[PDB]
Symmetry: D3
Subunit: 147 residues, 6 copies
């Protein structure tokens, strides 16, 4: 029952993809600050979107048993859903390897969300990262998965 | 709109503390796997708890405008709330500095949550991380704060 | 002779600051691409500016004998000098320590320049990072130098 | 202009190579100290050459949109051009991948140059890193390229 | 001069390596270990995870080491009470152009260092007696064992 | 508890700390022979290892889970060949001004320098052994001086 990096040595390298999303719940004082350009640290969404891409590459360094893999693609979307006072984040990671990139996609979303928080923290300490969840995955033995 | 790493050279040095929490909602399959020791990768809670502490230390590397700071204390708790079918993660970070440690606490919880996910991913890809939020903080200009 | 991280343990801690700059020479093709918004990878200046801030924090990990130290302030500016077909980067770093932060400022500028190259090389592989040089530094026994 | 790590998933993996160079212009005092063995921190060229190799491997961590890839070869040369009062750095990186390694070669040279600066700034803060540029690349769709 | 040996034209093949390391304990460190540590947590559990993490960080620690995609990592940290010794074993696997001996060695060395960190409050004299390779396979030179 | 934690030292004073460790690499005849020739073609083993040690001291917090990250104020590493003994000796002294010791930084510096010696010579002999990584001295902290 001890920790281990699962042996995937005898698995073929195949096209892999994963998509996840996360949301940041906005207060009124954070929504208005966001529309005016932030709290003085710069564009919250721009900094968070790039932070997501970087995070995807740093996933193996953050998740102990995660496999170090070469990434062939990373897309990150950070948008304001004004009607919901919510910030939606989506990330898709791709690779050609023996194991999936769900952690990379999830991590990109979680860190981008953490960055939105960092960029609006001044206006509202109570902002909440609500859900971080997988939306899609394809490539491995189990094939395609849809939320 | 340009990103900036807020200058804190001209700022009061005080004792700082921040506490955050996060949750991972489990499916029946994941709960069962958890109670049996995991999916074969090791104890989900033990590995996630350690991941949280490591993440606290890597915060400045993940959050673009976060200040690199010496951390004097990090406590992380990852617990199974059986009846609620969810795992609760709590993290408290302390330091003596010119800037707060809310991001270290938030990041610790987010990465611990992501690790719980990685450790149970095989049972259910649909597990959800949510409610990553700050619970307490003190030492800043804004003073004491509690959810 | 033998490499060493200079012993500065018994040196008094003082305010430290350093400013450096760097330039990236552009071709007409790269300039044109820049004004249209990039080559398809995104805004070259925006990405490079953040890369610079991040690079300042990673300095000690890149320069072998550099002293690791908490930074209290990081400012990075990336500007397009159109008629000159040049991108200028400037960075100022601050802290309170026993050694200077010249490297952090130099590194921030260099990596930002490297990122500008990455964001535009698809247009022209021959782009050149012309210079990376110090402009100012203060602190320590021996302060106050300016080019 | 939204940032993105270009999708190269379906591109075939091929042998890639890239070579770049950089220079550090010296002052009389830097040159003198360099010839004496440094400023007391150690041999500037030796530490810089090793720093360049390490830098190549850290390229993806420094350049936001760069693809993390497995490097299969890294050569770095750091030499003093006494007459020109200049230090020349050259680096050739290789890999088996879907994208080129121009960034790794450029980064290796830039960081090696930064390290030379670090190893001699105690003698002269005015040293200048100049001409970080690509000299050659090959292996991809575009084919061969060389600075003429 | 230093170089990352060019293995671009070498074929990708299954490669594996196993190494081990020991940490000699004092009576006081053993006593502390048996009681759950010095207050920082379970020494063996933290050390075992540190070893896996170390395997992944090998290329960043060993200058001329090649960065490669690891396919498997196993680490075991056991207390040999009577001997007053903690034994660490690690096996790394991959499909690459170069071996993973460094990954296995580094995993054992860092796990041992972590055992030291987790118990040094009880005794500063703890010793990492040795780190050595036990087996490797997959390369041009094929199989090797101590 | 028995659960991991980065010990709370927030209220402790920031004092001058120092630590010295050593490590050895036992050589085979082939490795010893390779060393005297300048290595196995990857470069000077002792030179690369010495730098690796300094770099390792700085990466200690990133390698040891519960170690406190702190600003190092000094790092010295020596890697020497003890011919008659058929082995390489490594010693490292680390310094800082903090609330916790640097025994880990000194121990890690020696361990990684040793691993690097192995990497730089394993082509000659895979049976090289890293023996005795141990602390020799440390001062600062409530416990005071301590010497092997």
């Amino acid at each position: 029952g001890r920790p281990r990096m699962v042996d995937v040595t005898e698995k073929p390298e195949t096209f892999r993809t994963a998509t996840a999303e996360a949301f940041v719940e906005l207060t009124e004082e954070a929504l208005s600050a966001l529309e005016k350009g932030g709290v003085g640290k710069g564009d919250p969404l721009v900094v968070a979107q790039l932070a997501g891409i970087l995070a995807a590459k740093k996933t193996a360094d953050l998740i102990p048993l995660c496999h170090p893999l070469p990434l062939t693609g990373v897309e990150v979307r950070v948008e304001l859903l004004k009607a919901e006072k919510r910030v939606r984040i989506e990330a898709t990671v791709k690779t050609k390897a023996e194991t999936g990139v769900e952690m990379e996609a999830m991590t990109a979303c979680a860190v981008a969300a953490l960055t939105v928080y960092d960029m609006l923290k001044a206006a509202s300490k109570g902002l909440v990262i609500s859900q971080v969840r997988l939306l899609h995955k394809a490539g491995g033995k189990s094939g395609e998965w849809r939320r």
